[PDB]
Amino acid sequence: PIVQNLQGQMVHQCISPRTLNAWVKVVEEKAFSPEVIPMFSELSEGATPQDLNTMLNTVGGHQAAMQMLKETINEEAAEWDRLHPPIAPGQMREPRGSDIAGTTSTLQEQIGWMTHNPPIPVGEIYKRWIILGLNKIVRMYSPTSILDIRQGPKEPFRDYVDRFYKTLRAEQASQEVKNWMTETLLVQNANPDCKTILKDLGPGATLEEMMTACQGV
Amino acid sequence: PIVQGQMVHQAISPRTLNAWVKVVEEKAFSPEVIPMFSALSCGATPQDLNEMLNTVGGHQAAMQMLKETINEEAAEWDRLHPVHMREPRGSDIAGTTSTLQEQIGWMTHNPPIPVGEIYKRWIILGLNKIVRMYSPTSILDIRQGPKEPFRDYVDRFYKTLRAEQASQEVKNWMTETLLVQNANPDCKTILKALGPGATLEEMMTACQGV
């Protein structure tokens, strides 16, 4: 991945054994639960397409999913080539579909594009395609989302919030949609007693005040 | 390994050594060991590559097969680039007849001679042959069982294909063709009905019930 040096300059570092081991084990244990998808993105902090491809190839099982991912990437790469189709002296060349995915580009070339002025985020673009592909497979497994989280009649408020934000962190939605989810679904899907209390608090209270209000009940 | 201020030599980390040895036991003969290699061996010198080789304890038959492939590639190297900073011969790239200082000189020269990457390439070629040996059956014999879930058949299909020596054109032709013909009668009939323009997602979802 790419990180800043002790001075402003951007430098590449070899992907760490800790990162490599964390990702493979996540796939083994969790399989394709939605929490796998953000967990990926946490490990692909400024990762190059080479590193992204490395991470994908290190996965041993679930080869059906890996092949479906490859199909989705090829579709996105085809669209990229459609939209962004000569010789420039000592300049960075234009990436095609396959170049962003690291199949036709070298490690040195990717570094050139990502550290260029203006920067060409081939790493972020490829990560987007992977996550798009990561969305398809997780959709297939067992269609579950934040909208299914409902407080049990006797369930402590604290544990319901825990389940809420665990699911919420894994749901693909913009920050605008996510904030709407926070202020709305958590209140409505509470149990009758706590819901009545949360409705009584008014629409301007922090989570601290909400949780302390439903502490007794 | 070698990393970038100025590029300098670093000793291989105990974390890297430990991670690799455990992979080998756990991975066994899974193909995914090959890409995992290429990650832990980032800018490694021939000295580091030799260390990693010796870190494998078991499966000594595979180690000798690897050594055979390395010797073949070293002989071909000597054929094409006859030696007269000195020029590296076959045996120098593998780190058996070269010193650490010689390896560092070649890798950090201007222009750089990537002896580390060349040795890595030869090892991966050999690791492919070993994985090929360890893969028990060729792609063409994989057939879906009468009661076998489609998902498990596809998993076996593409795991085998990943180990098959073929170009991307040959490999893509295998994908779009062999998977469809070798399905069981119920799934075959459904996949035929999809038409010749469906993605794998649609194929997999189609044979989900049966």
UniProtKB/Swiss-Prot annotation, chain B:
Residues 134-210 are annotated as: Dimerization/Multimerization of capsid protein p24. It is found in: Virion. Disulfide bonds: none annotated. It comes from the Viruses. The modification Phosphoserine is found at S13. Residues 54-84 are annotated as: Interaction with host PPIA/CYPA and NUP153. Phosphorylated possibly by host MAPK1; this phosphorylation is necessary for Pin1-mediated virion uncoating. Changing V83A: 2.7-fold decrease of PPIA-binding affinity. Forms the conical core that encapsulates the genomic RNA-nucleocapsid complex in the virion. Most core are conical, with only 7% tubular. The core is constituted by capsid protein hexamer subunits. The core is disassembled soon after virion entry. The capsid promotes immune invasion by cloaking viral DNA from CGAS detection. Host restriction factors such as host TRIM5-alpha or TRIMCyp bind retroviral capsids and cause premature capsid disassembly, leading to blocks in reverse transcription. Capsid restriction by TRIM5 is one of the factors which restricts HIV-1 to the human species. Homodimer; the homodimer further multimerizes as homohexamers or homopentamers. Interacts with host NUP98. Interacts with host PPIA/CYPA; this interaction stabilizes the capsid. Interacts with host NUP153. Interacts with host PDZD8; this interaction stabilizes the capsid. Interacts with host TRIM5; this interaction destabilizes the capsid. Interacts with host CPSF6. Interacts with host NONO; the interaction is weak. This is Capsid protein p24. It comes from Human immunodeficiency virus type 1 group M subtype B (isolate HXB2) (HIV-1). The lineage of its organism: Viruses, Riboviria, Pararnavirae, Artverviricota, Revtraviricetes.
